[PDB]
Each structure stands twice: as C-alpha cells, then as structure tokens.
Design a protein around this ligand. Structure first.
Ligand SMILES: Nc1ncnc2c1ncn2[C@@H]1O[C@H](COP(=O)(O)OP(=O)(O)OP(O)(O)=S)[C@@H](O)[C@H]1O
Ligand SMILES: Nc1ncnc2c1ncn2[C@@H]1O[C@H](COP(=O)(O)OP(=O)(O)OP(O)(O)=S)[C@@H](O)[C@H]1O
Ligand SMILES: Nc1ncnc2c1ncn2[C@@H]1O[C@H](COP(=O)(O)OP(=O)(O)OP(O)(O)=S)[C@@H](O)[C@H]1O
Ligand SMILES: Nc1ncnc2c1ncn2[C@@H]1O[C@H](COP(=O)(O)OP(=O)(O)OP(O)(O)=S)[C@@H](O)[C@H]1O
Ligand SMILES: Nc1ncnc2c1ncn2[C@@H]1O[C@H](COP(=O)(O)OP(=O)(O)OP(O)(O)=S)[C@@H](O)[C@H]1O
Ligand SMILES: Nc1ncnc2c1ncn2[C@@H]1O[C@H](COP(=O)(O)OP(=O)(O)OP(O)(O)=S)[C@@H](O)[C@H]1O
Ligand SMILES: Nc1ncnc2c1ncn2[C@@H]1O[C@H](COP(=O)(O)OP(=O)(O)OP(O)(O)=S)[C@@H](O)[C@H]1O
Ligand SMILES: [Mg+2]
Ligand SMILES: [Mg+2]
Ligand SMILES: [Mg+2]
Ligand SMILES: [Mg+2]
Lengths: 456, 456, 454, 454
C-alpha cells in the first residue's frame, strides 16, 4: 500500500502518524520545510518539499506507482488541482480530498461524481461534524458515538453518576441483568485515563463508559440501561457560520431551535433562510440575551464558533445559567478529551472527524481499521480474520483463548450482518470483523501480526 | 473631580464604567470612533476622537482644568508622551500611566520619580500580577486575597470542601468558636453567584467564602479556621516571559521552582539568569516532560503564557496528571470568575489587576473606594464616614441600625490603625472606613448618599 | 458581448477599464468588497462579491449566458477551478486563465490543451515578458514593439536624435524618400504632449516616433529608415529566475550572455542548465564585479530581479558605467512610462504584458479594444467595419472621405492576412480591421459609433 | 565620532550608509533582526537588537559615550522617549529626532525648545518638503537646489536646451562671458553617464548642469546665465493634506493658487482655512475638471497626494494637457531620479529631504558627508581642512597644486560666512570648508586622507 499525503498539517500529520507500519509506505508532501523535519524525526516516512499540485512535486512523490492519494492541504482549490494533475498525468488510483466548502458539495454530484474534477472521495469536515452532533441529539444521554469502517457496529459512551444504574456495580454484576437486549462494556475512561474492562472493574462516578451496540439498535441499548433520557426539546446554537447554520437546518423541523449570531448582516440572512429557527443577533457571552431567551430552559447549548475560547467560555456560562447539556467545538482533537467531562459535557473536533473518515478509507483493504475512538494512546479498532484454522492464529480459536497483546480487549464480532456481543467461549470464524479496544495503540502492529495468517 | 481617560480599551473602558456618577466628570479619549460610540451609549461621559498625546486632542479634553489624567493607551511611549505633553502644556495634576515594560520600571527612580518623564503614578500590570500570585503562594489554601485602598484591611477567600471545618455549618454556628482570633464572613459566591452573608446562611461545598482579616494577620486567621494548609514545596511555572521569569526570581530563593519555556533561545537565557531555578525548554502540553519532571509532585502549577487557551489546557492537564493546585493567567477579567473554581483553582487577570490599582487612585478623595473584589455586578467596597452625628446618616448610629441599600453588608470597620470585625452593636465613629460588600454594584451611589453628610 | 472577469486586481481592473463601454456587459467577481466598489464608482458594470470558483458565485455572475470568462485571481489553482466549475456547470465558452507557474505550463499539452482542465487560453506573464525582450533584441534600435490585429500588424517605436535620419524631415517628406518600403507614422510624443502625426509635422529631437509595419517586415522597415542598428553581441542578465534563466536559454546559443546571480546555490544550478552562459556569483550593484566583466563593452544590460529597486539601481549603474543600453523589469506598472526613455532605455512590466495578451484575445473575438501607448503618446484601438454601404457609415468609403474625430489617425487596414498601410485613397472593405490612434480618450466612444452599423 | 542611529529604515539605513567610514563609529539600533543583518552585511558597523527607547538597549549601544543620537523609528512617541531616556540616563549630546506630526510641531516652542522633551534638533519631513517646493517656485527654471555648508552654498540644476544659452559653449568660454557674476559648473549628466566638468567641456542639449552659487545670490546667477525664467503666476495643487494645505498658505498670498481635493469634507475645511485659494472638489485625473480650470494656463501643477500612482497619473495628464511644468511627490525614493526630467519636470521625496536635513546637522558638526546627486550626476561631499601646512597635505596649497583623485572637482571653498567660488589660484586656508564633487564613490575615502592631518 503506497500512500501519498499532500499537506502535513494537523490532519495530514496525524494521518501519517496512524499509518506508519509494515504494509504501508507513507510519503508526505508539504512546502514547509520545518513541518517536514519534525514529522520525519518521529516516524518512518518519506518527505517531499514542494507545492502539492505541481506535476514535478507529484512525480517526485511517485504518483504513477502509488495506490492512494490523500489531499489535505490548506485549500480546496489546491486539493482539487492536485487530484486533477495526479489523475491526468499519472493515473493515480484512489484520490481522497478534503473539501471544506459547502458550495462545492452542493454540486458534488455534477462536479466530482462525474469525474470532471477527479476526486474519488470527498472528506467534508463541516458535514461530518453536523452529522455527528445531530446523531448525539438523537440519543439523549449519549456522550459519544463511536463508528468503525464496519457501519453495522457502534459504541455508545455514557457518563456514570451517583444513584445511577451504573455507579457502584462491577461489570460482572451487570451481566446478571439480561432483559431483552444484552451488551458488553468496550472501554472505560476515568480521569481521562483508559481502563481495560474486566469482570471485576467497579464503575466509579464520572467514568466514561462505552457499550457495544449494533448501529441500528443504539436507542434500544441505552433504553435497557435506564440511561436513555427524555428527548431534547430546546436547542440553542451559538455561532451562525457554516456548521451552526447547517446544524440548525437539520434540526429545525424536529426540534425547537434558537440561534445566536453576533454579526447582524449575517444574522438577518439566517432569519429568512431558516423557516423554523428563531435567529438572534447578539454575543455569546451576553448574560441578558441568554436569560431573556430562557437559557435555563435549554436542553442542550451548542457552541459552534471557530474560536475555542469563545465556545468554552460561552458554554461554561450556559451551564452556570442552567442549560442542561453543553457542547463545544474544539479545533484540535488533543484538547477534546482534556476539556471534556468537567462542566463541558461534550467536545467535538472537525479535525478528529476528518481524520476518522480518512482512516476508514485507508485502512480499507488492510487488516486493522482504526475507529473514531482515539484518546491519547488509547483507541478502539476493527481487525479482519483472514484464512482458516490451518493458517490463522485466531480463526477457529475461542475469544478467551486468543493471544491478544497487552491492554487489548475484544468487545464484539461482526459476522456478515449480525453483530455478536463478545463472550469468552465465542469462536472466531473466517473473514470475521473483530472489534477490540487497546489501552495503548503501540500494540496495533501486534494485533496486526496476530490476525495475519501464514502464507497460503 | 474632573477625569480624563486616555485610551478606551478594556482597562480604560472598565475604569470609565466604574467612575460614572455625581461627583465625577469622565472624559475618554480614543482614536477609534467605534469604541467611543459603544461606550457613550452605556454611560454618561464625554468622548474625544484623536491621538491621546496630541496637544490639541488633550486640549479638547480639557487638560488645563482636569484634576486627574489616566493614560491607558496601547503603548507606553504614548502614555509617557501624553503625560509629558499634558504636564508641559496644561499643568494637569495627578497623572497616572500604565507602563508594561520592566525595562522602564528598572529605571523608574531616575526616569519618573525625578520628574523627567512627568508621571505621578506608574501602574505596572506585570509587577502587580507577580506580587499577587506570590501573595497567594504565601497563604496556602487561599483562593483570593482582596485588597482595598486602606492597606490595613484585606479579605481572604477559601473554597469549602466535604469534611472541612466550613461545610455544613451555618454562619452563626461559627460565631460560637471564638478562640484567639475572630473573623466575619464578608461575602459568599456559590455557582458563580453572590450570596449576602446572613446569620443563617448555610455554607455548601465549592462555595467561595471571603473572611475579613487585618492585612498583617491573614496567616493567623486561616490558621484559626483549620484552613491554612502546609507550605507549598514544589512550584512549576509555564511560560518564561515577563511575568513567568519575574515570578520565578521572586520565588527561587524560598521555593523549589521549575520553569518550562518552549523557545530554546529564550530558555537558555533564563537558565543563567535564574541561579536557583531549574529551567526546561519544552512545550506546556508535553505529557512526557511534565511526567519526567514529576508533575505529580508539584504543589502548584502556574500557567503564565499570554494565550489563555494554552494556559487553560495546560493547567487542566497538570491537574489531571496530579498537580495539587493550578493557576492560570486569563487576559480578560470577565472570563476569570467563569473559568475559575471547577478544575482550575485560581484565575488571574493582568487587566483586573490594573483596574484594581487604578480604582485605588481615583476613588481616593472620594467617599467610596472599590476593592479588588469585583465579580459581575458584585463588588466589595470601602466608604468614608465624614462628619459627626449632627450632619451624617451613619456616624454615631450602630451598624445594625444603618439604612444600607439592598444586598449590602458591612463586614468590618477600619478606625485609625485598628481593624474592627463588624458586629450589630458597633457604633460608627467619625472618619471611619466602613467596608461593605454589595451583591449588586448598582447600589453604590446609594451607599454614597448614605455616607454623604449634610452640607456643613 | 457578456464578459466575466474574475479578480479585480491590477490586471482584472485594467481589463474591465479597457472594455467597459457600449456593446459590452462587464461583470467583475471579486472577494474584496473594496476593490469592487472603486470599480463600480468609476465604471458602469456589475460587481459580484464571492469566491471566483464557487458554483453559486459563478452562476450569480451569469456564467450560463456569458460569452467569455477571464480568470485573473491570486492563485492558478483558483483560476483553474473557476474555469473547471464554469465549464462543467454552465458550459461557459472561451475560458481564459492566467497561469503563472512554469511547472503547470511545462505540462501545458497534457493538462489544458486536452480539456482535462478546461482552460481555452493560457496567459503566462513570465513567458510573454521573456518573449517581449527577445523580440526587442531581434530588432536593435527598437524601444518598443506593440502588436495589433492578430499580431499581424506592429508599431515600432524609436527615439529621434540630433544628426539623425528622422529629425528635421516633415512626415510627408519621409513618404517621398522611401523607395520600396511602405510605412506610416502612427504616433509621436515630444516634450510632454502627444502630437497628431500630419504631413507637415517636422520630427524634432528626442521624439518617440511610432511606425506602422507588417509584423513580418519590421526589420525591412527599420533598415530602410536608417534606424536598424547593428546586431547586439554582448548581453548581461542580472537575476537568474524564471524569466532570467529562460531568457538566457533563448539567447545563449546565438548571443554572448553573462548572467549575475547573488543566490549562490541558484547560480550553481543555472551554471549547469545554461550550456553557453557564464554565470557569476555576485550582487548586481557590485562595481568591482561589473567593471571586471567589462560592463563598458556590454551592448544590453538586463536587470530581471523581483526587486524594482535592485533593477533600477543595477541598470543605472550599468548605464553610468558605459553599457550601451539597459533594460529593466518593473513590477509596479505606474512607473513604467516614466522609467523608460532617459537613463534607462527600456522598461518592461509583466502586468502590462498580461493585459496586452488578454487584449489579443479581445482582438480575435472582434471586439474593439482601447489601449494607451507609452507616456500617453496616443491611445490606440483596432476596430472592425461591420455591414455594407447601406448600413455602415464607413464601409465602401475611402479614408480621405471619412469624418474621423479630432486627434484620430487611421494607421493601417487589415484585410485577412493582408496589411495595408493606410492611405487617403485606401477604401475600407467589409469586415476590415481598421487600426487607429487617438490623442484623447474622450473621443474613444465616438469612433465606435462610426463602425457600428444600423 | 561615535554616532547612534535608532531605527534602520530607509532614512536610518541611508544615513548610516552615508557616514560609515574611517573616523566614524556607527551603531544602529533596531527592533528588526533582518534589517540589522542586511546593514551589517553591507557595512562595518555595530548593530543592536532592541526597542530604541529602552534604557538597557540605549546603554548597550553606548549612549553614555556617544556623541550624537539620531531617532528615526516608526513613531514620534518612540523617538521622543528615546531622546528623553538617553538624556536623562546618559546625558547623550546632540539628540536629533524625526517628528512627523504637525500637532507636535505646532507646540515646538513649548515642548522641545525648552528641554521638557529633550530633542535638540527636530527633523520634520513634511515641512522640509513644503519648504523645498516653495524654494523652487522662487527660482523659476530651477530643476533642483541642493545645499552645502550651513546652506551657505547652493547648486542650481538646470536643463540645457537647443537654441539655449548653455548649449554649444565650452565651460571655460562661459567663465569669460559672465561680467559681474562668479559661478562654476559643479556637475553634468548627459546621456546616461556623468561627466567631470572641465574647461573644454562643450554643453550639449538636455544636459543637467549644476552651478555653484552662494545661497544669497542664486537669483543673480540664474539671471545672468539667461536661465532665470519669468515668475510663475498660476499654481495648481492636488491633494489638500499637511503638505498641500501648508504649501497653499505659503503661496496663496503672493501667487494665484487653485487646489483640487477629492475628500469633500476636507475640501470644505480647506476652503475656510485658505483665504486666497480656490478649492475644487474633484479627482486629480478628471479631465473635465482640469480642462474647466484652464490647465493649459497653469504654470506649475503640483500633485501632493499620498499615492504615487495618483501623483504620476495626475501630473502626466496635466503635462499632456498643456501645463508648463509639473511637480510630484514621490514616496518611494528609488524612483525619484528616474521620474524627474522627462515628462515630469520635478520629483520630490520626503525621505530624501529628511536625509538632506540630517546631513546639514552632519555639516554643522564638521564631519565630511557623502551625498549622491540626481541620477548619479556626481557624488558630492563637503570636507574641512584641519591643521597647518606642517600637519596637513592641503592647508596652504592652492587648488591648482593639489593632487585630487580622478573625477574629483573642487567647486567652492567656504571660509566662515564667505563663499569663494573655487579657482585654480584659490588657496585653502585652515578650517576651510572645501566642497567637492566626485563622479565615482570608489574615490570617496581617498579624499578623506587628503584632509586628515597627521
Ligand atoms: N500549496 C501547498 N503546497 C504544499 N503544501 C501546502 C500548501 N499549502 C499548505 N501546505 C501545507 O499543508 C499543511 C496544512 O495546511 P494548513 O495551513 O495547516 O491548513 P489547515 O486548514 O490548518 O489544515 P490542518 O491540517 O487541519 S492545520 C500545512 O502544514 C502546510 O505547510
Ligand atoms: N461571542 C460571539 N457571540 C455570538 N456569535 C459569535 C461570537 N463570536 C463569533 N460568533 C459567530 O460565530 C462564528 C465564529 O467564526 P469566525 O472565526 O468569526 O468566522 P469563520 O468561522 O472563519 O467563518 P465560517 O463560518 O467558518 S464560513 C462567526 O460567524 C461569528 O459571526
Ligand atoms: N495612539 C493612540 N491614541 C489614542 N487612542 C489610542 C491610541 N492607541 C490606542 N488607542 C485606543 O486605546 C485603547 C486601548 O488600546 P489597545 O490596542 O486595546 O491596547 P491594549 O494593550 O490591548 O490595552 P487594553 O486596554 O487592556 S485592550 C484602544 O481601544 C485604542 O482604540
Ligand atoms: N505550549 C507552550 N509551552 C511552553 N511555553 C510556552 C507555550 N506557549 C507559549 N510559551 C511561552 O510562554 C510565552 C507566551 O507568550 P507569547 O504570547 O508567545 O509572547 P509574549 O507574552 O507576547 O512576550 P512577553 O513575555 O509578554 S515580553 C512565550 O514566552 C512562550 O515562549
Ligand atoms: N542584487 C542582486 N544581484 C543579483 N541577483 C539578484 C539581486 N537581487 C535579487 N537577485 C536575484 O533575482 C532573482 C529573481 O528571483 P525571484 O524573482 O526572487 O524568484 P523567481 O524564481 O524568479 O520567481 P518569481 O517570478 O520572482 S514569483 C533571485 O533569484 C535573486 O537571487
Ligand atoms: N519600537 C521600535 N524600536 C526600535 N526600532 C524600531 C521600532 N519601530 C520601528 N523600528 C525600526 O525603525 C525603522 C523605521 O521603520 P518604519 O518607521 O516602519 O519605516 P518608515 O515609517 O517608512 O520610515 P523610514 O525610516 O523612512 S522606512 C524600521 O526598520 C524598524 O525596524
Ligand atoms: N485623485 C485624487 N484627486 C484629488 N485629491 C486626492 C486624490 N487622491 C488623494 N487625494 C488627496 O490627497 C490628500 C493627501 O492626504 P493623506 O496624505 O491621505 O493624509 P494627510 O493628512 O496628508 O497625512 P499624511 O501626510 O499623508 S500621513 C488626501 O486628503 C486625498 O483626499
Ligand atoms: Mg477535468
Ligand atoms: Mg497619404
Ligand atoms: Mg522632560
Ligand atoms: Mg579657473
């Protein structure tokens, strides 16, 4: 697998970090020499200093031979130009590009899906975020929904609280309750540190507990944990930009939505374009605006401006003034787990989201796929069981008898269209998709080795 | 009292906001028309659009007749030029100027105190902050030390916690304990909202409780509340700029200080200039640097970079990694109370500090002086009891019999050199300094009226 | 004619300014509200605020109906995306784009000429500039060569001097002293004011005289006016960049070229890429370097750095130190007419060159285009004679019987591939290309009326 | 001589460049590491990185021991603080400061001349520029007036023309045809190269000839060279700013002045402040406005906006439209020598003017200062003859017996308040001020050796 990453920013670099290994040859292009040196010190990859869409720069990165091209530069127009130039001159297969402009996506069918602009897969960070928040809204009480390249399976995170079904009970004590639907804990995060879920792991308060669920039965699982809270009525959105306006349009038909936008010329525009949203012109930190429009009633306050501090301060104010749940948009995913949990209920990063999507396309045709759950060294992953018992170290063997790396816990198996909750006696069959959670991502290539069969 | 404020930034504007009234005529100079319109809408003051140090602009603000000149522009050199031009051309008395440069203050004696540069009072925001943090370090457990223009009296804030002397006990129940030293609660802040301290006010957890103390006996009061924790051993400072390097120099002789500075060229300089400080070159968010230098041992982690988010994220990480107490430098005082309390122990603003100092010079020769305790509408103040019983509405009368405005509580009286803890039977004598806390600062001019005697 | 210009910078703005008029609907798209306003204040055109390559912005500027799209934004990648989006979504005809990157141009065949990236016409200023200089070197004595028609016609500017062939002679007296060559004076600039060339106009010293010539007979005209100087032998180029390195390749095999380049790692690279050029490592203003390499022998000194300040100081030093002629590259177009002529013989601007080229695409699409000449010597336009005698006020008539506005001079008529030097007896036939020069831009729209049929 | 220059911009940099040499220890302070490096790369001087007014930065540049402090930073308030801090902390002598604000200058008496703000010498470029133009208007025909000594000596530049008094005459032939007036040609610039003025130098057309004259007898010299033109009657100023409004006040009472100002609220203000000036509201490039107000009658058109582009286009239009002479204000100093002379008669730069003034303070402190003339016509310096015959190689000798370097011409000798036009028999006495002109800057340090005693 020969991979070229155009632009070594947060997204390109983090991607590069997640793809270094045996079966992957990573080359990164960037015109900033400082960024290249920094990345090369940490990881085994090749670097090209130049403009990502220049024919020679692209040639020097070996676009004729490469198997995938990922364009994550500063600009859509450079990403588009890179994919055009690469395709036209070198026939480079699998061209993925980040496109941040909703204007382009509005014509994505006519522009990209016709091969006019030769992009195979658009990664639209603004769209992904809007979809994620909306999906959280759909499951009141849900702290995080984890996705895999296998769309049939998901994880749902919830926060344990005093006098809740979860707090105090060990994991094995929950397994005594089998009514209607049964799930298994995939991961724990207390105090920002990952705990490997064992039978005798006592759930403490303020833990972030991730349960395994079929993607089409999340509501049903949360219900059966007495953790599905009543539907959100009142949503308040701060920041009427690309993301804010998008989310409001998606919600206004089913929810009661208020939006605050401090630019009057932009705000007036949003009032007509949003038929069922009440749009206010005002500042996010304005106590008297938040009070006048009853912030004490708001079920979820969502801060979606582009400045993290504005969002943070705003949401912290909303919580102080009685908003039930608050969500903030944090730019860099590193800060997400940090700022989350205490006072701020949920933090979402457009960079994380982009990276999550990008890992579902690259890890495709690989053994292991990384999930959208990545916190520090911790991360949930999916691996494929190729081969039969004769050639594989996992196929045929039972889950309780698999030589997993340290810190690694198998949470569920996806066989065809059925999602099986992991048990010790369960036998891994061929071409299964095994979902694991690792406390430390350094053992991924070990998981890779484990699931890699002998040469047929 | 005729006051000219040069520069209507955060400091100038906030000052202007605090000084509007009957006995004060406020004029603000600024070259940004937008900033002027905004301020005039809210407050009764005069605005001049021009350069603060131009002879005509200064003339147009009435510098010949004015009684005080406050220079808080963007630049020290403009502040200095304004004070020179005002003095030389109009003999304007009482010239206060903000000087941010330690280089100038290093020669403050030869430059200002000689009348070469005609500044009467330097307001040095970097120095004030360094002094404040240091003063907090001196009283382990102290959340905030409140100062007044009467240097003889102070307030000390502490946070109530479960199984602590404070939590659960009503205020009257504390008055049953009179050993050695006795104090009175001046203010309460729970959930960021001010509560007027009454006899039957039950102290809840995480409340910010302010006790009255003589400025020279703070340690003695905290001791007698079982709230003076053991001396801080290990201090870790992030950001080796003006403030960070300053604080380290002050502490290194009495504390074990580590400093982190990400710029290697600046960091190397600090290693030699700080004889007893260990200086590290590295990033604030670097988990492995913080761990290698045992952040789990750090008694107080102090984030003093100029970026609030950097400081916030950094300190939140330090707390997660086990640092006992964390303090952050937040630029705008509005965010200070917001970000404080939850996870971040203390937030300090250089703007607040400047404003605090500026209010001790202006309110001088006034009736009321505002303290360094200002949180939203809430603020602690000091008023002077001028006149005798014949002409005053407060002198002679007992504290329990004073027609105070709503939300107002007298906490202590400073008579000469003795600080008297307020009791209901205490009689106000002449020229006393009465310390009150108001839940809403809108009643200040009422306090002013109350302490204003009849025309002699 | 509905024309869309993307980006209202120097080039986009000047262009619109050159085409705003009667038969032209100019819409300018730009990301900057302020540049649009200035343009609307000055001219009656439509302005659209948005990103030049966004589908809605292109549609809102009416790309569906438009007849030409000109992309002159900040970056090639936006120009390309814009041409792409316009073609794919709206089938916008005649898509012209500025492409500054030699890297993209190196693959011009594979990228653009195949319709992968749908640019119909590339305007590459660096190349045009390089080409212009080379064209000047080819005609020693030429201060300026301007093109009209499809470049089929040219003007050759020369400066008249004391004890010279031009000075002293009336214009009609020159038509009688030229035996087998046909030319016409198109414009003159003496003192600080432009003069309309008449029969009784005596050429005074230091005048810049513009002659009309067929492009394939420029050398023959200059020769027989005793104004074609002997071939340049020694050329010195300062600055080995895109333009410098390029111009050197074009010259080194037929001329003796030395190049000065202060970037030492760059100088080494060029030393290899230039088979017949001597590359010196040094600063352009270094006298001890310039005197060492015989600047007094240098026929043409060419300063091609990106710094106008360097170019000017460099050339003036060279001129001071005895170089015969000096040519500079000027970025800021305002100064070009000034900088040329006195101490510095020739000044060349990449923005001007772009505007020229964009107007050669105007000249092929049969729109009349105004252009100002050097130092306001005259404003030049080329117009088409539409209609027959019945519907046109010009077709059929001889030049001597046409009521042209004051200050207006017809210089030549272009019939197909045939260039007729304008004479009083010359009859304009239908669809002819009449190239004229005006002393005043205030009479510009009047000429349009002549050539616009009923 | 230990000299500190605060701020290494155009002015600070040029200054250092003019004074770096043998007897001068130049230290430049600047906030920008890059500007310092370029300066150190080019010249051997000391560079200090810090804020020009910080006590340690001033001390580290050796303000205690320094002999002159020049403040040419970005803002007056920093220049002032620097002069303040230097005086208060280190007693730094001769503190020169650039002050651009007319507001500060309006209170020059009360603020600076009293030692409240310890600036010894104010350099106010806007005023100097205004003063220069006014001085040009006073001597019609003067293209340039440059000053030497304590302004006691001047050069008057004029352009020679066909059928003119200068052209055709050898220089020695002019000394014999001037009856009761004494002058000397100091420099000439013909073609693109400077010529050393000798007896047998015949003046050709379009040469710029510089004459030496006592400052109090400039008019008498120009008159008796048949080169003093008749007084200007009609003046037109574009741009009513600090310089424009100021120049108008100085001219309106003795000349007929019209002013064009596109800022309408500004035009109204000036209409009141200018008792004898007609203020028109309009753009400078508006032909219908320029033709309405008889631009063909205008003796001098002066474009004083902050936009070079406006000034150039404005003036060239005026020159095109028949105005006798046009003068412009040019911000970017690189273009000045070029822009002047051809279509635009006079170009004036505020940065150059500042450098001149800063060098008049150099001329009072008895340091020899180099300055380049217009278009490199010659480099001019004024030097002092220190010592007696025993210790000096120049004192006592007559000019005709002094071995000057090649290209070097002594133009005048200044003894006290007495200006002696240089002659071969003229003997240099002690502490004389000898003003010389060099064609080449490479012979500059050689001249110092002559005047430096043992
Ligand atoms: N035209 C270009 N050619 C090559 N590399 C580029 C180009 N533009 C940007 N880059 C590099 O690509 C990386 C990403 O660019 P940024 O300016 O960080 O854009 P961004 O929108 O912040 O995206 P990220 O990845 O979330 S920081 C940067 O590190 C740049 O150095
Ligand atoms: N304090 C505030 N209160 C209310 N609205 C705010 C506040 N701060 C920012 N906004 C709005 O929220 C968004 C923050 O984004 P900005 O960084 O200002 O712009 P931007 O995000 O670059 O533009 P977009 O939306 O991505 S096309 C803007 O639309 C602001 O109008
Ligand atoms: N030279 C000047 N003359 C007059 N007013 C000025 C000048 N410079 C700045 N101001 C105004 O003074 C105010 C404070 O300036 P800022 O640029 O905000 O400086 P600051 O260091 O941020 O100080 P603050 O008050 O904490 S925001 C601004 O609102 C400016 O509009
Ligand atoms: N992530 C980080 N880790 C460690 N040190 C940091 C980090 N970010 C900033 N710093 C340092 O902390 C300070 C932050 O201030 P900046 O805004 O970069 O500079 P500055 O404060 O304007 O300069 P000063 O100190 O006020 S003269 C700087 O000295 C940085 O070197
Ligand atoms: N004083 C000088 N003497 C000699 N060469 C110089 C001098 N100043 C600049 N140059 C050279 O002129 C060249 C012009 O290169 P640049 O214009 O900077 O880059 P480029 O590759 O030509 O791309 P463009 O077209 O300018 S965006 C540079 O390589 C410089 O080294
Ligand atoms: N506060 C400062 N302290 C020290 N040096 C400074 C300061 N501000 C500017 N300088 C330097 O002073 C020089 C003058 O810079 P500018 O004032 O920006 O140029 P300018 O206003 O065009 O005036 P000049 O000198 O004609 S370029 C610059 O090179 C700066 O690097
Ligand atoms: N095309 C034009 N026609 C007439 N007047 C103009 C034109 N362009 C600019 N101006 C005027 O020229 C004047 C010059 O003013 P400015 O230079 O902008 O300000 P100023 O008060 O002179 O301060 P300085 O010295 O430039 S920092 C302006 O008031 C403009 O209105
Ligand atoms: Mg295509
Ligand atoms: Mg004829
Ligand atoms: Mg003083
Ligand atoms: Mg003689």
């Amino acid at each position: 697998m020969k991979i070229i990453i155009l632009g070594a920013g947060q997204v390109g670099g983090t991607l590069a970090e997640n793809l270094v290994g045996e079966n992957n040859d990573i080359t990164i292009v960037d015109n900033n020499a400082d960024r290249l040196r920094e990345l090369q010190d940490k990881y085994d990859l090749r670097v090209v200093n130049g403009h990502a869409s220049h024919p020679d720069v692209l040639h020097e990165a070996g676009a004729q031979d490469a198997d995938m091209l990922v364009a994550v530069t500063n600009t859509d127009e450079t990403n588009m130009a890179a994919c055009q130039v690469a395709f036209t001159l070198f026939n480079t297969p699998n061209r993925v590009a980040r496109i941040r402009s909703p204007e382009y996506l509005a014509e994505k069918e006519a522009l990209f899906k016709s091969g006019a602009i030769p992009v195979d897969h658009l990664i639209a960070p603004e769209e992904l975020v809007t979809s994620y928040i909306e999906r959280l809204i759909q499951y009141p009480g849900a702290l995080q929904v984890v996705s895999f390249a296998e769309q049939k399976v998901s994880l749902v995170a919830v926060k344990a609280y005093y006098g809740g079904p979860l707090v105090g009970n060990a994991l094995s004590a929950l397994r005594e309750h089998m009514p209607h639907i049964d799930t298994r804990v995939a991961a724990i995060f207390r105090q920002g540190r990952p705990i490997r879920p064992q039978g005798t792991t006592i759930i403490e308060a303020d833990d972030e507990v991730f349960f395994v669920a079929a993607s089409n039965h999340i509501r049903s699982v949360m219900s059966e944990l007495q953790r599905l809270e009543k539907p959100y009525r009142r949503i308040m959105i701060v920041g009427g930009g690309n993301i804010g306006a998008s989310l409001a349009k998606r919600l206004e038909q089913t929810y009661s939505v208020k939006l605050i936008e401090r630019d009057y010329q932009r705000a007036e525009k949003l009032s007509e374009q949003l038929e069922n949203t009440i749009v206010f012109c005002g500042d996010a930190a304005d106590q008297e605006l938040l009070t006048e429009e009853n912030i004490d009633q708001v079920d979820v306050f969502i801060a979606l401006t582009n400045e993290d501090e504005t969002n943070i301060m705003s949401a912290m104010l909303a919580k102080r003034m009685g908003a039930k749940k608050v969500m903030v948009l944090i730019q860099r995913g590193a800060y997400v787990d940090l700022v989350q949990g205490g006072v701020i209920d949920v933090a979402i990063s457009p960079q994380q989201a982009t990276i999550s999507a990008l890992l579902t396309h690259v890890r495709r045709a690989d053994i292991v796929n990384v999930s959208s759950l990545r916190r520090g060294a911790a991360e949930a992953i999916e691996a494929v069981a190729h081969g039969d018992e004769t050639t594989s170290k996992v196929v045929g063997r039972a889950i309780g008898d698999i030589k997993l790396p340290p810190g690694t816990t198998i949470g569920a198996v996806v066989r065809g269209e059925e999602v099986l909750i992991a048990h010790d006696r369960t036998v891994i069959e061929q071409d299964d998709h095994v979902v694991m959670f690792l406390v430390d991502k350094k053992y991924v290539p070990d998981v890779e080795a484990l699931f890699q069969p002998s040469p047929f």
